[PDB]
Amino acid sequence: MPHAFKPGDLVFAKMKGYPHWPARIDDIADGAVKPPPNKYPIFFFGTHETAFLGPKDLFPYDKSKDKYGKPNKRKGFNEGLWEIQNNPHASYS
């Protein structure tokens, strides 16, 4: 049965106006800016951008990849697909 989301979990993350996007729940580095309450720091593969999202926008990767893991015209998306499949826990700093 599911647990709560934790850093390192892989997802497709939904933002208004964008397709469901390959992403991870990130750690917060010591000394770094914390997210608001009930929000997680989401690192988007490909774009390498961070946004703060709640669980309603977070779709677990294994369950969702057959639906959402297809090439997309959008900038950074297909690079993102490669990252989530091939090295989802690397440093992309």
3-state DSSP assignment of residue 12: strand
Residue type for 75, please? K
Beta bridge partners of 22: 12
State the number of CA atoms in the 13 A half-sphere of 33 facing the CB.
7
Strand, coil or helix: what is 63? helix
Closest of 91, 90, 88 to residue 24, by C-alpha? 88
**Does residue 71 sit in helix, strand or coil?**
coil
The experimental resolution of this structure, in angstroms, equals 1.6
What six digits make up the tokens of 49?
A: 């951008």
Query: Domains in the chain, start-ordered, CATH in brackets?
Result: 10-29+39-86 (2.30.30.140)
Question: What are the beta bridge partners of residue 24?
Answer: 10, 43
Residues 6+ apart with CB under 8 A from 20: 12, 13, 14, 59, 64, 67, 68
Give residue for tokens 């997309």.
72
